[PDB]
Amino acid sequence: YKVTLKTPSGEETIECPEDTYILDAAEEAGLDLPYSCRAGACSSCAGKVESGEVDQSDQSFLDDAQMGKGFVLTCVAYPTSDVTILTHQEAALY
Amino acid sequence: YKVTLKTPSGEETIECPEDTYILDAAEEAGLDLPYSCRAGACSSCAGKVESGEVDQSDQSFLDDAQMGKGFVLTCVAYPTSDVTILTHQEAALY
Numbered sequence: 001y002k003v004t005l006k007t008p009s010g011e012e013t014i015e016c017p018e019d020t021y022i023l024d025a026a027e028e029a030g031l032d033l034p035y036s037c038r039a040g041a042c043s044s045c046a047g048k049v050e051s052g053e054v055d056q057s058d059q060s061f062l063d064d065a066q067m068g069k070g071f072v073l074t075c076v077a078y079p080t081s082d083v084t085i086l087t088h089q090e091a092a093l094y
Numbered sequence: 095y096k097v098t099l100k101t102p103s104g105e106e107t108i109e110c111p112e113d114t115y116i117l118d119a120a121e122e123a124g125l126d127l128p129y130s131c132r133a134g135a136c137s138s139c140a141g142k143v144e145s146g147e148v149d150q151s152d153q154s155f156l157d158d159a160q161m162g163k164g165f166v167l168t169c170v171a172y173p174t175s176d177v178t179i180l181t182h183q184e185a186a187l188y
């Protein structure tokens with residue numbers, strides 16, 4: 001799928017298979033998106049989904065309210081469609 | 095030295111030896127601060143020094159203007175005094 005990342009330094013477009021995490025695809029495309037635990041247990045890789053859908057079932061930090069609002073932990077999220085994500089949204093959680 | 099980190103989720107205080115990078119000390123203290131390259135070549139770990147001094151000689155992403163304004167790449171920065179850093183300042187560079 002095509003993933004459109006709206007990052008502080010600009011928009012980036014990458015290709016990410018349905019069985020690859022968004023963060024992993026971004027790294028393979030030469031981007032340096034933020035992370036820490038890479039295990040769905042913090043909010044360092046948090047973004048916000050603006051279009052499309054993700055599957056982030058292994059995450060455990062976000063509550064249902066936050067996911068409901070579009071928050072995504074990019075280290076454990078697969079795209080299930082083309083997706084637009086606003087990156088660097090950890091602060092928006094607090 | 096004592097490092098005061100002003101993070102989205104609150105203030106944290108950690109101890110960081112003069113020969114340990116701020117990010118490494120933070121991780122040892124159980125914090126999950128953002129990073130990517132861990133090599134001073136991106137801005138994912140960027141913060142802003144509000145008090146004290148750091149040595150970040152191995153960094154290579156920030157220009158002298160940015161460092162002049164207090165920006166720090168925490169993955170390759172040593173404290174040379176007690177330091178207060180505002181974390182998650184990558185967006186402030188762009």
Ligand code: FES
Nearest residue numbers: 036038040042075
């Ligand atoms: S890096 Fe910790 S949840 Fe993604």
Ligand code: FES
Nearest residue numbers: 130132134136169
């Ligand atoms: S993580 Fe890339 S400069 Fe620190």
